[PDB]
Design a protein around this nucleic acid. Structure first.
Lengths: 164, 256, 290, 138, 54, 361, 97, 137, 171, 80, 144
RNA sequence: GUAUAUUUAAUUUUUAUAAUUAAUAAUAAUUAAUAUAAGUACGCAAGGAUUGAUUAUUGAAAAAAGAAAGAAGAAUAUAAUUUA
């Protein structure tokens, strides 16, 4: 127990890290199909697809909260999980232990714009990024979202051909 | 933007209807006549107590079948409005008269003979009636068993009804297996031959003596179980005798 | 025209009321019914709603009435009340959810309160000269306010003298008695009347009988039963001057009765007029009254 | 009990559902739909589910810098007649992206137009199968 | 975080730094000199109660 | 969450209300005359030692005379100084004083509308039935207690309770189903029986919405207050002194009746006015049932500003009086709608051009 | 202070030949309304009396014009020019004739 | 009944009585014959420069009983057409909007030729309130 | 035996709480009551409170009886001019508390005066009345209602001729 | 209304006594003159008490004129 | 302008500065933060005497060499933290006439001196008097 | 730290009507992204801040005066859809 004499919760740091919505009748995480602000950011261990020339193919997230609504106000670190192989350079020299940032390109969950549009992509998509917010892959093999049009994702915008 | 309370949320029993945009889920086509969901919301029929939704459906079927067999039915509690609405739906099916409607009513009810009776008489009985075909009176006499309000659910336009014409239900007949009382001014009416034959066959069973033995055995069973006012099977007397049979036969011949 | 006016008998025609001039914007309804008709309704239909409607019409029409009409109005309205009773105590429903019942007055009490407010507005804020001009109306209003315990509104809500209520003088921040506490019912009118007496032309115009009635009305209106010191002194001085000036001239048994009534009023107001007492004791021309 | 949660004041306990018949809600809503039609945010449509299912729709979303151009089918339609409370589902399929999206009518930026006068239920079925397979694989 | 003391008329939601300026030190009014001390101060200063004619 | 530190006007203390602080010339009161000097007491024995009784101060006289001459001969240059001597009249709308009553309207329905940009608003349409000023109230004339009671919707005689019917009969206003109250200022009064039109508000103003929440009945802690300081304790091991909790404190989230309650949304922008059908659309969704008698008031300030002002606009003080020639029965429903200007500045699906990688224009 | 009780539970519109002018229609409606009002008043042979007594009608009105129609000044976001509107009207008239 | 609850319970009627006495003052003054209502003096000294050399204004409003009665009795004037035809602007544009763009000086890179009449960024940020003497926006 | 009902009069009840001046009880007698005027200008607040309480509670009468609540009304005027000896105006605390955990209110006589000086005088009178009678609510309350407080020199009791209250300090 | 230079630029918050004049040319701050001359750019006490000022010529030469027990001057009285 | 991004006023997640929403009772005037320094409440407004320093409400009767000459006795108000940022009082407003300059002839034409910062402050012209009346000129000392 | 009493939450059912005072939920939420200022202040130079807006963090709440043992629904979302 800590502090002795008045024990507190040892989850103080993760409270700052994560964003939690009090599950009350007036406050809940919607299904993402009712309107803007409804949904739920991804947890830590979520596995998602990484689409680019990089050898990596699957990425496990590290951020306690990941969503398109705040893809520009937060950093999404992640670790390559299932890397591909070749049969024969930095893009192809990824390892299943290295840690890079990621840029959301789509969510398999129902995403609602402020315009009333609702979308459901088929794959949770991301791309590897260096600490300087520059993607490791040469190009992309999936469509980004409106959130990826922020200046915080300038190189991602340059590479990604198609948006949604 | 999203509403403050998100998702299908249960409200108070008597609460208003808000048009906030929410995903609505219905178990099936509630607009179907006899397939209606039971609930305490305003859009649903009241759900009278039952051991399960299947048991509630069985109770609804039994109530509707009894209503068809004898227009008047006395039902206790929340099941009275449900029975009235189901009777209205049956009348709507009969007025529609489609083969699919008849097959649906056959699926619902327990008695194909009663299905035929309804589809034969209700069309002409309620041809001139628009919406409300069943009335629901409330009886000031509450059931001593559990003190539950009793409702007399009846069909309207009895005069236009063919097999139920001149029937007065102020008091039941001398025996439950005898034809119901008939108004004095309507004593000459004659019922359809098929319904008359069906009723006669049903009554013969009780006219049999093995039914008297079963009745005495029921006296014994209730006495053993604990029902207090159950006279001893030695003191009980048969419901049906020869002199009573001939008197009731004369009465039936007179009434026609 | 836009449709047909279905015919109806005169007995069933809606009359007695007129819309406001600016109907498209102001759609209020005023009552032009005669005071005699209002009093006849009040007396012939003793129903609570009928009396409430009559009182509402009277309150609306106070400013349009004359002195005699107001006198008739007050005389007709002062019927149900008694002297010792608790005026404006129209308690009908009893609510005892807490454990100590409280009795909620019916719609009659608001009717009388609104009538008093309308009378105050008419005779103070609009036509302050009417009370000075007409002493009879001055006495009638004071007698009405004495008959209805305007200065003891707790009696309006009390149901038994053993458990007097405080719905008229208690008010908590949470919300208790917010709509029944601290009504200025008759305070402004009483203050204006006191000022009129204290400034008299009113007493000069009044008659000795009118002065006695005025003093009695003041001592009755005051919750303690005694008139204000200054008002009592002024009325007593005026009455003594008039008695001394007129006694030398012709005098009557009615005048003696008036003097005796004044002496009794002083005693009730807890003062004592030694000069009046000595005059009555010394005089022997006529026998004294009760 | 230092606080209260329920109000029993007449103002709040009162409801005007009885008097609601004085104002025509449906006429007002249809007038709003016609105003949208006149402004051009949407065009009138009177179709049934059988008629519309499977029809090709072209969506032009006027985002920036480059407007988003998509071609999809019609998975479902909320209502069968012109109304603000409408909406239409589409299954857009780009090079390697399969996105199923609900688009509401009357939005000035999401110009969605059913490019064909009719649809094929067989096309709807096969496109739905494709979407189901993509979703399962994802 | 306090669960009471929310009557702003007596416990205003302002800091001690903000209330220091309003804390009075040379409180001119209400006065702090009782009437009983007037004669004592007079005598201490040494003045005398001369008759009105003087 | 809160910015009370931002919410503080320029502090001043009355000890500083001195002749040397006044922006304009400091004027003393001598009864029926205003003077530049303190009133010299008539009894000279009251003069104090070292006290100067000024009768003609050349500096003050010259400065005041120059000030007055400039104000009189250069009104345009010194227009802002006019308010010093020519205060605004009473009974006219005042930016910082005038508070006007509101209205009562039923929650008609819900719909969805779109801004000039691609922003979607879930609008709630509230119907305003026959509304009239039912009563005027004041607690014995106390300043600031003036209140106006406004009716909601006509109703038969048999509908109300006897006491409510008696109240409406005494008022003389047509019987109304509901009657709300609004504290106002004297200048905002309107005569009893006045007719209130939906145009009393403006398409883009800010309204306070008071309503009753939908009744959810008796619900548990997970439903209401669902998520699933210190009194005395020793920070160091120096000593042993503590105060445990010996009861339940009054503030304790616990299971109870959640539902019906007078909720009040503050500063909801108005989105659309339809004065032909008497409807107001607010771009928000209420947790209330259809038919609830909502009360609309006018928000008086926002972000340290005032809702009514020359920069934004002014209201139809005291209320909106429709012209004479116009006849609503001679107008269609589409000819009688007032749409608000955009609430947001950019397309909320995207980002503002400053934060946007590339923009099309 | 109140309206007179109900006087009509069923309604039926009466139209004249479409060629009749608006002034003619208004005049006919006003004449019929006046005659029926006089018949009711005298009730409290002729067609008005026959209608009031035998048929039983006890109400008649001349409701305002249905102005709910739309003034389409713009279709699909495109302004409707006066020349285009006149051309469309002429085309519709020609098709009708 | 708490201490302050009891104090206010006892004194609120007493405060009402004191206010009644104060009103009775003017009521006597009126019944004497001087129907004119009590007049409150106008205070010219309301614009100040506080200790920190900041402008301060005391807002004083006087309620006229005659004006209040007139408002309660008579109809108000017809609403102006502009008031009910134009909307209430949802934004509050800056008092001193900043526009670095200007086409007057050739080679706009030169700062020393920018017009002085347009605001600076410091002015744009600082001007959150009306000019010093003025109070209304 | 005597039985006081559990169903008491509560501040939250519509019937409300009474005013013992207008009540009629076996232990209330306003017949022998007098009216005094106490000008508290330049008089120490505790001394003024004690002097006023002596007359308010009726202890100044030779017929005083603890059971009987009879006392003379005292109109205290110029409470604004009441004096405190030294720095006590800001160094004397007033402490109360609510049932809530935080609950505790510590305030200064300066704040009490700035809100309502009559409130401060009422506090001191209450302290005296509690010092002498604390075991009965009626005794604790009635004398306080007998007391009258006014910060200015204007009071509406001129119709009672309150005789000035003359006393001397212990010194 | 609209945008204006009055909204743009804020005046000096100076009291009437301190202000030398209300003229438009003197509207600006005193330090403005020094700033212009140099061609560059660049709080009341807790108890601010001032003894009343007097005209220069009258104050520097005050006649020693008195009355019964009060100093009398063409502009001021006093006690002595 | 339109190209710049103004502060959200109608809809925003940021704190909307309305401390009076749940702290004031009854009528609230639109004047922002008029009852803020009191503690954000509008109660206890019936008090006439408050805590006062020199030059405040109840010190008007007392004499203080500064305020006795630099503040009108009737201009005194409330205490420090109880300052009157906004006052509402019923009654008939009285516009007392402004003071009239004295020792000036009638119909006399004065001479105007245009003060400006262009003249150095040390110059006696700045300390001169703007409005100059012929009757204010000492003609026996030679002054013009 | 194994439903009694206290305690707390809520209720005591349309109250035409919140608030004179008692008590009571939010005394700088930092932080993160982008832009303005500005490529300015400053710095030998490379370099380069302070800083009120937008977004992200999604919720927004008022106790005390009227008549009472059926279903606050005559229950199938209309306070009568014609109805015999």
């Amino acid at each position: 127990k800590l502090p002795a004499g008045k024990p507190a919760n040892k989850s103080w740091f993760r409270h700052n890290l994560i964003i939690r919505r009090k599950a009350s009748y007036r406050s809940r995480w919607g299904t993402g199909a009712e309107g803007y602000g409804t949904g739920v950011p991804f947890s830590d261990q979520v596995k998602l697809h990484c689409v680019d020339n990089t050898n990596c193919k699957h990425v496990r997230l590290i951020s306690k909260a990941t969503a398109e609504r705040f893809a520009h106000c937060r950093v999404f670190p992640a670790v390559a999980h299932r890397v591909s192989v070749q049969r024969f350079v930095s893009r192809h020299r990824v390892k299943p232990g290295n840690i890079y940032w990621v840029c959301l390109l789509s969510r398999r969950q129902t995403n609602t714009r402020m315009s009333g549009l609702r979308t459901n992509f088929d794959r949770n998509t991301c791309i590897l990024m260096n600490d300087q917010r520059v993607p490791l892959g040469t190009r992309v093999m999936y469509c980004a979202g409106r959130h990826v049009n922020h200046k915080y994702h300038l190189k991602a915008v340059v590479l990604a051909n198609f948006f949604v | 933007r999203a509403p403050p309370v998100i998702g299908c949320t249960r409200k108070a029993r008597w609460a208003g209807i808000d048009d906030n945009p929410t995903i609505t889920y219905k178990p099936w086509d509630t607009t179907e006549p006899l397939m209606a969901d039971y609930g305490w919301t305003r859009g649903k029929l009241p759900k009278f107590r039952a051991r399960s939704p299947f048991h509630r459906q069985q109770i609804a079927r039994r109530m509707v079948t009894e209503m068809i067999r004898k227009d008047y039915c006395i039902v206790g509690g929340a099941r009275a409005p449900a029975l009235r609405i189901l009777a209205d739906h049956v009348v709507e099916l009969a007025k529609a008269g489609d083969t699919d409607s008849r097959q649906q009513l056959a699926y619902f009810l327990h008695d194909p003979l009663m299905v035929d009776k309804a589809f034969d008489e209700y069309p002409r009985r309620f041809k001139d009636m628009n919406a409300k075909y069943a009335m629901m009176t409330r009886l000031k006499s509450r059931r001593r068993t559990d003190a539950v309000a009793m409702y007399f659910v009846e069909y309207k336009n009895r005069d236009m009804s063919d097999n139920h014409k001149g029937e007065d239900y102020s008091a039941g007949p001398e025996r439950f297996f005898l034809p119901p009382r008939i108004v004095e001014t309507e004593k000459g009416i004659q019922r359809p031959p098929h319904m008359q034959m069906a009723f006669d066959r049903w009554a013969s069973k009780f006219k049999t003596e093995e039914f008297h033995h079963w009745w005495r055995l029921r006296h014994a069973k209730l006495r053993y179980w604990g029902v207090r006012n159950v006279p001893h099977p030695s003191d009980v007397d048969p419901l049906w005798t020869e002199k009573e049979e001939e008197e009731w036969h004369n009465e039936m011949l007179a009434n026609t | 025209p836009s449709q047909t006016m279905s015919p109806c008998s005169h007995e069933e025609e809606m009359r007695g009321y007129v819309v406001s001039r600016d109907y498209p914007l102001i759609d209020r309804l005023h009552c032009t019914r005669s005071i005699e008709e209002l009093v006849a309704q009040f007396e012939d239909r003793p129903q609570i709603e009928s009396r409430v409607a009559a009182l509402a019409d009277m309150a609306s029409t106070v400013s349009f009435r004359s002195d005699e009409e107001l006198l008739r109005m007050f005389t007709a309205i002062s019927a149900p009340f008694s002297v010792d009773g608790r005026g404006l105590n129209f308690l009908t429903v009893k609510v005892s959810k807490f454990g100590r019942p409280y009795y909620v007055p019916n719609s009659l009490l608001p009717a009388y309160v609104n009538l008093v407010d309308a009378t105050t507005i008419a005779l103070v804020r609009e036509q302050p000269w009417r009370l000075s001009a007409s002493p009879a109306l001055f006495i009638q209003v004071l007698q009405f306010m004495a008959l209805i315990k305007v200065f003891e509104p707790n009696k309006w809500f009390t149901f038994s003298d053993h458990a007097p209520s405080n719905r008229a003088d208690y008010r908590h921040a949470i919300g208790v008695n917010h709509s029944t506490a601290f009504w200025g019912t008759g305070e402004e009118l009483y203050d204006f009347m006191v000022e009129l007496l204290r400034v008299p032309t009113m007493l000069d115009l009044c008659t000795r009988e009118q002065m006695v009635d005025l003093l009695s009305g003041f001592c009755g209106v005051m919750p303690c039963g005694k008139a204000v010191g200054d008002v009592f002194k002024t009325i007593t001085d005026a009455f003594l001057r008039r008695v001394r000036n007129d006694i030398s001239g012709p005098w009557s048994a009615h005048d003696w009765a008036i003097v005796e009534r004044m002496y009794l009023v002083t005693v009730l107001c807890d003062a004592g007029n030694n000069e009046i007492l000595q005059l009555l004791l010394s005089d022997t021309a006529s026998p004294r009254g009760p | 009990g230092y606080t209260r949660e329920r109000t029993n004041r007449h103002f709040f306990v009162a409801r005007a559902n009885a008097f609601f018949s004085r104002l025509p809600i449906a006429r007002v809503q249809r007038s709003l739909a016609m105003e949208a039609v006149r402004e051009g945010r949407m065009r009138p449509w009177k179709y049934t589910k059988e008629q519309i299912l499977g029809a090709p729709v072209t969506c032009n979303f006027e985002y920036n810098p480059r407007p988003v151009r998509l071609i999809g089918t019609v998975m479902d339609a909320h209502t069968e007649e012109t109304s603000i409370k409408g909406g239409l589902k589409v299954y857009a399929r780009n090079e390697e992206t399969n996105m199923m999206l609900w688009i509401p009518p009357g939005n000035p930026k999401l110009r969605h137009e059913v490019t064909s006068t009719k649809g094929s239920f067989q096309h709807y079925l096969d496109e739905r199968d494709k979407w189901d397979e993509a979703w399962i694989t994802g | 975080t306090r669960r009471g003391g929310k009557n702003l008329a007596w416990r205003p939601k302002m800091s001690e730094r903000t209330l220091e300026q309003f804390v009075p030190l040379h409180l001119a009014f209400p006065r702090r000199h009782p009437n009983s001390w007037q004669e004592r101060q007079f005598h201490l200063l040494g003045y005398v109660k001369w008759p009105k004619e003087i | 969450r809160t910015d009370w530190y931002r919410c503080y006007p320029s502090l001043m203390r009355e000890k500083d209300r001195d002749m040397y602080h006044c922006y304009y010339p400091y004027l003393f009161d001598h009864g029926d005359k205003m003077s530049l000097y303190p009133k010299i007491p008539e009894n000279p024995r009251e003069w104090q030692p070292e006290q100067l009784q000024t009768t003609y101060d050349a500096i003050r006289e010259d400065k005041y005379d120059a000030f007055i001459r400039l104000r009189e001969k250069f009104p345009e240059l010194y227009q802002d100084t006019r308010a010093w001597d020519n205060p605004p009249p009473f009974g006219e709308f005042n930016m910082f004083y005038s508070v006007r009553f509101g209205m009562v309207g039923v929650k008609a329905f819900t719909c969805k509308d779109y801004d000039e940009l691609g922003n979607q608003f879930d609008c709630t349409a509230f119907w305003f039935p026959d509304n009239q000023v039912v009563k005027h109230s004041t607690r014995n004339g106390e300043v600031g207690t003036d209140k106006v009671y406004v009716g909601a919707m006509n109703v038969p005689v048999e509908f109300h309770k006897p006491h409510v019917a008696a109240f409406y009969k005494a008022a003389g206003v047509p019987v109304k189903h509901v009657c709300a109250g609004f504290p106002i200022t004297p200048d905002a009064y309107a005569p009893v029986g006045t007719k209130l039109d939906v145009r009393h508000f403006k398409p883009g103003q800010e309204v306070t919405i008071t309503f009753q929440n939908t009744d959810y009945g008796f619900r548990g802690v997970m439903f209401r207050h669902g998520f699933d300081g210190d009194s005395r304790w020793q920070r160091r091991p120096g000593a042993m002194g503590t105060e445990g909790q010996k009861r339940i404190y009054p503030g304790h989230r616990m299971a109870g009746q959640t539902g019906a309650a007078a909720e009040t949304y503050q500063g909801v922008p108005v989105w659309r006015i339809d004065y032909k059908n008497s409807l107001i659309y607010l771009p928000t969704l209420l947790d209330a049932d259809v038919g609830t008698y909502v009360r609309f008031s006018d928000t008086i300030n926002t972000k340290g500003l005032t809702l009514w002002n020359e920069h934004r606009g002014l209201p139809a003080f005291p209320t909106f009086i429709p012209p004479e020639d116009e006849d609503l029965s001679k107008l269609a429903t589409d000819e009688c709608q007032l749409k608000s200007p955009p609430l947001y500045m950019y397309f909320r699906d995207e980002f503002p051009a400053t934060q946007l990688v590339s923009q099309a224009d | 202070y109140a309206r007179r009780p109900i006087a009509a539970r069923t309604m039926m519109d009466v139209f004249l030949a479409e060629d009749m002018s608006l002034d003619e229609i208004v005049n006919f409606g006003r004449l019929s309304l006046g005659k029926l009002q006089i018949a009711l008043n005298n009730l409290r042979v002729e067609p008005a009396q026959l209608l009031v007594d035998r048929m039983g009608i006890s109400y008649c009105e001349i409701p305002s014009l249905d102005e709910s129609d739309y003034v389409f000044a713009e279709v699909g976001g495109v302004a409707v020019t006066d020349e285009e509107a006149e051309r469309v009207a002429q085309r519709w008239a020609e098709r009708c004739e | 009944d708490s201490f302050k609850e009891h104090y206010h319970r006892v004194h609120l009627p007493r405060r009402l009585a004191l206010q009644r006495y104060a009103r009775q003052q003017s009521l006597r003054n009126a019944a004497k014959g001087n129907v004119k209502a009590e007049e409150v003096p106008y205070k010219y000294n309301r614009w100040w420069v506080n200790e920190e050399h900041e402008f301060v204004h005391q807002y004083a409003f006087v309620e006229d009983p005659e004006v209040t009665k007139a408002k309660r009795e008579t109809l108000p004037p017809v609403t102006r057409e502009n008031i009910w035809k134009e909307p209430q602007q949802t934004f509050f544009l800056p008092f001193a909007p900043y526009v670095r763009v200007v086409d007057y000086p050739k080679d706009p890179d030169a700062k020393f030729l920018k017009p002085v009449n347009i605001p600076r960024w410091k002015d744009y940020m600082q001007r959150t309130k009306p000019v010093i003497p003025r109070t209304w926006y | 035996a005597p039985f006081k009902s559990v169903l008491r009069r509560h501040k939250h009840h519509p019937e409300g709480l009474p005013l013992y001046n207008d009540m009629s009880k076996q232990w209330l007698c306003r017949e022998g009551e007098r009216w005094w005027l106490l000008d508290a200008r330049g008089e120490q607040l505790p001394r003024v409170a004690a002097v006023a309480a002596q007359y308010i509670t009726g202890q100044h009468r030779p017929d005083f009886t603890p059971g009987m609540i009879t006392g003379d009304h005292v109109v205290i005027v110029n409470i604004k001019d009441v004096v405190m000896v030294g720095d006590q105006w800001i160094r004397v605390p007033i402490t109360w508390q609510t049932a809530y955990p935080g609950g505790k209110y510590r305030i200064r006589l300066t704040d009490m005066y700035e809100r309502d000086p009559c409130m401060l005088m009422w506090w001191f009178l209450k302290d005296e009345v509690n010092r002498h009678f604390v075991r009965k609510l009626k005794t604790r309350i009635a004398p306080l209602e007998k007391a009258w407080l006014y910060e200015d020199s204007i009071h509406p009791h001129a119709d009672k001729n309150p005789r000035p209250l003359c006393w001397t300090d212990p010194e | 209304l609209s945008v204006r230079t009055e909204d743009f630029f804020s005046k000096e918050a100076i009291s009437h006594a301190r202000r030398v004049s209300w003229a438009p040319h003197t509207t600006e701050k005193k330090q403005g003159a020094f700033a212009k001359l140099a061609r560059s750019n660049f709080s009341f006490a807790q108890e601010p008490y001032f003894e009343e000022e007097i005209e220069a010529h009258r104050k520097h030469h005050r006649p020693d004129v008195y009355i019964y027990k009060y100093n009398v001057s063409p502009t001021h009285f006093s006690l002595r | 302008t339109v190209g710049l991004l103004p502060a959200q006023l109608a809809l925003s997640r940021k704190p909307r500065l309305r401390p009076h929403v749940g702290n004031l009772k009854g009528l609230v005037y639109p004047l922002p933060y008029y009852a803020m320094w009191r503690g954000n409440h509008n109660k206890y407004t019936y008090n006439k005497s408050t805590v006062c320093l020199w030059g405040e409400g109840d010190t008007r009767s007392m004499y203080h060499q500064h305020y006795a000459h630099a503040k009108c006795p009737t201009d005194y108000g409330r205490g420090g933290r109880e300052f009157e940022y906004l006052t509402v009082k019923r009654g008939k407003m009285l516009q007392k006439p402004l003071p009239r300059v004295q020792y000036v002839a009638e119909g006399s034409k004065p001479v105007w001196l245009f003060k400006s910062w262009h003249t150095p402050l040390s110059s006696p012209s700045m300390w001169e008097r703007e409005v100059q009346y012929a009757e204010h000129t000492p003609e026996h000392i030679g002054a013009k």
